Amino acid sequence: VLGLYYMTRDCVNAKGEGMVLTGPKEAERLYRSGLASLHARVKVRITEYE
Amino acid sequence: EIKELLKLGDLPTSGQIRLYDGRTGEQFERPVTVGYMYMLKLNHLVDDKM
């Protein structure tokens, strides 16, 4: 629960804030590369199903 | 007094240091409380339980 909560929290100013991401994979790449924080507010293209 | 004794030893006052994951070498995102604790072995050994 703590890890998911820490993963899903936002910070007002964080590394990589304002970036526009092609998808979740690019977010993972940016995080593991250290270019963006988990809490960075970004616009991400998401495909969902209903 | 604990803070002052830490300061005499050139250690951080907060009692938390920057740790790195040995599996990846990456810094943990937050400082971690690292210190010394007195630990015991409590006679409830598994080889007496299995």
Partner: protein, 232 residues
């Protein structure tokens, strides 16, 4: 022998697609799974050479937040689509492509002006959608060869005030790797429990296959080590 180690005897490849592959190696000495996996992951993420789109100029667009008629997507979404454009260039270090089209429907990668030194992986890839017969789109895109990923925020400088009107900046995804992940599981050889099994899940753009990407990353690391190796 104290200098003898376990080299993987079971190698398995599961191709989910032409771009997705799962490579499993076993057995590995205890802890070697994390070492090799993390080294390969870092090299693939941050150092793999490749070609990607970096700058875009659109005739009717002055800044990234400018609106243009006749295009369903905003300029930001067009920039994302251009980030998704997988292109490989032969010989040339930097190329400029031009895209002009008018017509109701999708404007895709197949409409980009062809160059003998440039190859597009997915012509079906959608760049934008044009909504009217009275609508035209004309853009110039810049493809360069580099390593890893350089965000546009790193390159926005006052030293680059030479940028004329509408020199939009695009994140450069040079590395072919779209996703690299590794997992370490247990393995045994004759009841020798403390052994590692390495699973590598790799997805890349259609520039190179995942196996080629792994081979190139390993080659890069081995070439880095060559000055310290004292054996064959």
């Amino acid at each position: 022998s104290v200098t003898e180690f376990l080299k993987p005897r079971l190698v398995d490849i599961e191709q989910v697609s032409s771009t997705h592959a799962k490579v499993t190696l076993e057995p590995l000495e205890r802890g070697f799974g994390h070492t090799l996996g993390n080294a390969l992951r870092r090299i693939l993420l941050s150092s793999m050479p490749g070609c990607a789109v970096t700058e875009v100029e659109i005739d009717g667009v002055l800044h990234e937040y400018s609106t243009k008629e006749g295009v369903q997507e905003d300029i930001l979404e067009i920039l994302l689509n251009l980030k998704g454009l997988a292109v490989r260039v032969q010989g040339k270090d930097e190329v400029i492509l031009t895209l002009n089209k008018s017509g109701i429907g999708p404007v895709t990668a197949a409409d980009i002006t062809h160059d003998g030194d440039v190859e597009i992986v997915k012509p079906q890839h959608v760049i934008c959608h044009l909504t009217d017969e009275n609508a035209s789109i004309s853009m110039r895109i810049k493809v360069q060869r580099g390593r890893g990923y350089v965000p546009a925020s790193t390159r926005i400088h006052s030293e680059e005030d030479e940028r004329p009107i509408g020199r939009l900046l695009v994140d450069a995804c040079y590395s072919p790797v779209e996703r690299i992940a590794y997992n370490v599981e247990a393995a045994r050889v004759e009841q020798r429990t403390d052994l590692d099994k390495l699973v590598i899940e790799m997805e890349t753009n259609g520039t190179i296959d995942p196996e080629e990407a792994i081979r190139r990353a390993a080659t890069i690391l081995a070439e880095q080590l060559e000055a310290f190796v004292d054996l064959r």
